[PDB]
Amino acid sequence: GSFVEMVDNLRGKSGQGYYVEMTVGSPPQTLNILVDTGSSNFAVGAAPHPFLHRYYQRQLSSTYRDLRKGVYVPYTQGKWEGELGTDLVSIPHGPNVTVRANIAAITESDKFFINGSNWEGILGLAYAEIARPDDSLEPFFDSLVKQTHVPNLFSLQLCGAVGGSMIIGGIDHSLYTGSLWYTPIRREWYYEVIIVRVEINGQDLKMDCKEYNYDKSIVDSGTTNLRLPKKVFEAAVKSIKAASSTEKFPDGFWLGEQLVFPVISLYLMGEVTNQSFRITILPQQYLRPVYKFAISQSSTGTCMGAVIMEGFYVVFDRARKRIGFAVSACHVHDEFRTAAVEGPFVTLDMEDCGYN
Numbered sequence: 001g002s003f004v005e006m007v008d009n010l011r012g013k014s015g016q017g018y019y020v021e022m023t024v025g026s027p028p029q030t031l032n033i034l035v036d037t038g039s040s041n042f043a044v045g046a047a048p049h050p051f052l053h054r055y056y057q058r059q060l061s062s063t064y065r066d067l068r069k070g071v072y073v074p075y076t077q078g079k080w081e082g083e084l085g086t087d088l089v090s091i092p093h094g095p096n097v098t099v100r101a102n103i104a105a106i107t108e109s110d111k112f113f114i115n116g117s118n119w120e121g122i123l124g125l126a127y128a129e130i131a132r133p134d135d136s137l138e139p140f141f142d143s144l145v146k147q148t149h150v151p152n153l154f155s156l157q158l159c160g161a162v163g164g165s166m167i168i169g170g171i172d173h174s175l176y177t178g179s180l181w182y183t184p185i186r187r188e189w190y191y192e193v194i195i196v197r198v199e200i201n202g203q204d205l206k207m208d209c210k211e212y213n214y215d216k217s218i219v220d221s222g223t224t225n226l227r228l229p230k231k232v233f234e235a236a237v238k239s240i241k242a243a244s245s246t247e248k249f250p251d252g253f254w255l256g257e258q259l260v261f262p263v264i265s266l267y268l269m270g271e272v273t274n275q276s277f278r279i280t281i282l283p284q285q286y287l288r289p290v291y292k293f294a295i296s297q298s299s300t301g302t303c304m305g306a307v308i309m310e311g312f313y314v315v316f317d318r319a320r321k322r323i324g325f326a327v328s329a330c331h332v333h334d335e336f337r338t339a340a341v342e343g344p345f346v347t348l349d350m351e352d353c354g355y356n
């Protein structure tokens with residue numbers, strides 16, 4: 001339908017994440033919370049860290065309940081650590097409901113909070129299997145669905161340079177143009193998808209598609225870049241470099257070691273046997289103003305981060321185990337080329353593209 005009061009409920013800074021306003025405890029304690037489809041923990045600052053505008057003060061909340069258990073969460077760059085419990089959570093600019101969700105009260109963290117950022121926590125919207133310490137700690141959205149009449153679905157419109165919309169429990173049709181195209185969620189842990197073909201400026205990379213999903217391919221609102229696996233990255237860069245011989249750039253720039261074009265198509269597995277669709281991004285999407293090359297190599301797989309997500313309206317249709325892509329109404333298009341979602345295409349042996 002409409003969900004007009006949820007539109008434009010996300011803020012941020014370039015490369016610094018997208019956040020929704022949330023309240024915790026009774027009376028409500030307001031916190032800005034990073035929106036992360038690449039993790040499954042709801043975690044907030046609960047101690048006066050210098051970088052924080054505010055923090056969760058448990059002693060002030062009557063509805064707080066201690067779970068008397070600790071949680072240690074190391075990311076690649078840095079870690080956070082906290083004390084588990086539950087409390088009443090709301091999303092002011094979301095649905096009118098209040099849920100008892102697990103909260104990780106961050107007592108200690110290293111390289112997690114950003115000096116100068118305006119957020120105080122993280123909302124992991126992915127599934128239980130990747131929730132820390134283990135799959136028994138129910139992720140926020142799972143509690144929201146179990147406790148209220150909010151449908152098991154949420155959508156994201158991230159708008160490049162910073163704002164956007166998280167539509168909880170539905171789809172706002174104003175936020176996209178044309179048809180939605182759905183790819184199946186491979187397994188419910190990350191939001192894992194299968195990439196079946198990659199074109200740089202409408203030319204196939206001719207690679208084994210099993211390479212494009214090396215380990216995994218996921219939709220990650222918490223990652224800034226498009227993260228391509230090493231083997232795919234090298235072939236992609238060489239091809240992007242080939243199109244861009246009009247200009248000159250240092251060797252380290254493509255490696256993400258310096259600062260300062262072809263469209264990039266990702267063919268994704270469709271709902272139907274031998275059927276695919278493709279999503280297409282403009283240079284506006286992978287050239288991030290600080291300009292930086294917002295495509296980087298990875299060992300964990302393809303991460304369809306903010307670079308990808310900023311061109312498209314993205315439906316996390318958890319109910320139907322699928323993810324929807326449509327042209328975002330807010331993506332950065334010029335007069336020449338426009339970001340696209342196109343289909344159907346004929347693609348055989350798509351099932352073989354998923355690494356095991």
Ligand SMILES: O=C(CCCS)NC1CCN(Cc2ccccc2)CC1
Pocket residue numbers: 016017034036038039075112122218220222223227298300301302303
């Ligand atoms: O581990 C993964 C998926 C690996 C394939 S790329 N995603 C994490 C999930 C946690 N998220 C937290 C975070 C987000 C923004 C700023 C700081 C930290 C960082 C990205």
